[PDB]
Amino acid sequence: QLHCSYESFDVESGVYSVSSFEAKPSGSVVEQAEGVECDFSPLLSGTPP
Amino acid sequence: PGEMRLASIAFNHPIQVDQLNSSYFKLSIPTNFSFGVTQEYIQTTIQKVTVDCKQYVCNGFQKCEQLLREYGQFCSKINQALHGANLRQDDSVRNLFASVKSSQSSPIIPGFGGDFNLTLLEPVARSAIEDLLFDKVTIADPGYMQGYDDCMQQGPASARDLICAQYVAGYKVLPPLMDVNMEAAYTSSLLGSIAGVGWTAGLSSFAAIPFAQSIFYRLNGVGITQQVLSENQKLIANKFNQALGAMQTGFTTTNEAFHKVQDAVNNNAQALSKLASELSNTFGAISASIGDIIQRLDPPEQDAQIDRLINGRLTTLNAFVAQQLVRSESAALSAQLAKDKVNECVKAQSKRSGFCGQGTHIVSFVVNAPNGLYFMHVGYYPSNHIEVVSAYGLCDAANPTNCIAPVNGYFIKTNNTRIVDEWSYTGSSFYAPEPITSLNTKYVAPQVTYQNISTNLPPPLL
Amino acid sequence: GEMRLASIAFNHPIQVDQLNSSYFKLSIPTNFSFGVTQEYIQTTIQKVTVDCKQYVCNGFQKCEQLLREYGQFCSKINQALHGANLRQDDSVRNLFASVKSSQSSPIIPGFGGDFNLTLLEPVARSAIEDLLFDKVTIADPGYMQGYDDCMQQGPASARDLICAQYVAGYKVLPPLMDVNMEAAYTSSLLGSIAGVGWTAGLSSFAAIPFAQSIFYRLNGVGITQQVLSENQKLIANKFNQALGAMQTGFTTTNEAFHKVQDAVNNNAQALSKLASELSNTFGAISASIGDIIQRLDPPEQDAQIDRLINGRLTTLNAFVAQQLVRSESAALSAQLAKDKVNECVKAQSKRSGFCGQGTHIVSFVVNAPNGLYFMHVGYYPSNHIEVVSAYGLCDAANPTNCIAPVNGYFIKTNNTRIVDEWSYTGSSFYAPEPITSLNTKYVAPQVTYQNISTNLPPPLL
């Protein structure tokens, strides 16, 4: 990469900055509303029709 | 509070002294004096930084990586320009320190300077005065070690440092070229380079004489007579210490040199902070975040929004480089000024005026400061001026070819009861009459304004 | 092998222990050497001008009509560049006014006696200046043969940006100074040598041998005259060795040399930045105006032309601003050179600071491209020894008889030729000698002066 920045096959000696590590991704964490619950409980009591 | 008051700006009139006709003239001479101090801050460097030209622009999202290739040559120009500016800053430091070092010095010991207080001595180290400066400075904590692990989740949630924001922006703050302990040693060597000061220019020889002794030599260098100095030796040291002691109260916002230090700190901070704000600056793009525009756009549209975002981001980087180049050059010029002051205001007494403190010149000192050097100049302030009668010279009336004129002082009509002679000699710096003797005078060609003395002169006796 | 981590060394100053009482330790060198340092002070920016019509477009009628709306930008550009060039020529004249002298010595071969003096012209410029020009990597010069070196009547291997100058519409203005006149100016400065001494030197011209002016300068730094007379050939030999090192001075580790090369590089970079922009589209279909004209219906054609014109104008504006900044920095640098000609060159200096770091002794200046190149001869101390010394001496029989050394020190004698317990020395070199009235002056008495109870010749009584 350093050679490409100077467009040459012989870079002058020195200390040179190079691109930083991206670190790394990790598995997702999500929070959203929960438990809205379609209520089928009437099926469980009394005499069915 | 009441209403504000309009006021005229005062004009301090100079003390008037009459020009005078014929062979004699009024002469104004101080009858009191005090030591005092002035100070300066000379910046010598710009903080050195580099910028990752990919990370600043994007976060490694792949669409940017493909698009960025079209502009890859701009980044090389950016990196090269910054690298060269940083190289120049390092070279200037090395260049300065080469003249700072002395071939030889006195060892530094406690109690140095005798009766002088010398709070500048190291806590054997930096100095107590340098530590007062660094504590008054408001700058954020340094990186390197432990560095990054003070940025990372194992630390306080309250850090707000631009220094740990460095790991978000793709920023790198380069370390200073020199370890602070070596810098302290360079200025310790300057403290030990005092004495010799006199005895020629001092360029190779080292007189190694006590600091108090060098001060008296300097006082004779400004025309104070030796007799006065021997009488007042303790008094001089006490006045000097009062002026020196005021340096502990000198670190206030009313001290303009101190204010310049504070501004130097915030010039570096300001440059970095501008770019942090630019990370959020949409250019009319759907969002300033690349990930947002990826998640909300069909890719044919998405790429157009990315390019618009990239163009403005590159533009701020270009502007930033131009800003850095200007600052680096101004620092280099300022560093050159400091180099001359070390070789004049510090290493030797100077007669120039202008430079150094505004009170003739006597010894000056320099200490480390953020991004620069901080000078203190001891100076001499005259007081209680009186007018006296004075003559251009004296000659023998019976032998007109015998003519003399004072050296480093003036002939005055005597006003002192211990001197039977009608004329007396005093130093240029202070009022204190003395007998005229061959040591205080030199032979000169005759002139019509010289007095015709028909009575008694010891130099020449006849 | 692997690179190695290392501490940065800190050279410690020689320590000299402080002593109490009326006498003190004194450090004095016992050897010395001549040596040199060099500096490059740029004084000018190469002067250029820009055809503001041809940079943008090249005679196509449609862009000319479009350009007329923006024609006032070019007028601003041309005026700014013209003013920048006038400033560069002002600085040249101002510098030369101090370079010239009312009178000078003739200069012949064998000048300087035993000194080698390689700087003398090959009557010419100088061999040293030519070495600098040969080491410099700068492109072949303009003006003659010029335009016919662009043209097919020359080698196919030419790669000069100067031929590209006639494509881009650039004009390189000639330097005002004229290299032959410039060489004459540097010889005039050499003719003011021998010398600066014998009062201010601002009226009279001493017209003495070069070696004599050197001895004067050496006595001006506290070397005793007696030493100078005994070492005359030795001094010439050490001096010539320092001068001989200039043949190795044209290397990449010489920072002054490096700066000369980069001044050349900076001028080339300004032009190459400009050349690359001719091919830079601004989202235009092509960088060529004629190509987009050939390919487009005219109602659409000038949308492409407009995009292209505006980006081209913007690069010219940025370019002018860059030149204005560079021109100002050069003017300041030229003032510094003038100061050194009127200080470091025209006189011996006591200031330290300026000139090479070895006290000061005569310095020289030669032509360099776009500037002046200075060389500074200097004195480097060595082999320091510590000796006993006293603040002054006075007759114990009469407290008012007090003396102190002039430009030197009173030291206890360590020399077998001197019967006297004390001896005078020069301050630049260890050189003990008898104390005599020529090397001392009467002073007011002080408590630290030694009380001498026997033999003092100054005063005898």
UniProtKB/TrEMBL annotation, chain C:
Q: Where are the coiled-coil regions?
A: 261-305
**Region described as Fusion peptide 1: spans on this chain:** 126-147
Site annotated as Cleavage: where? R125, S126
Q: Where is the Coronavirus spike (S) glycoprotein S2 subunit heptad repeat 1 (HR1) region profile domain?
A: 208-313
Please give the superkingdom of this protein's source. Answer: Viruses
Which residues lie within the region annotated Heptad repeat 1? 232-282
Q: What is this protein called?
A: Spike protein S2
- Please name the source species: Middle East respiratory syndrome-related coronavirus (MERS-CoV)
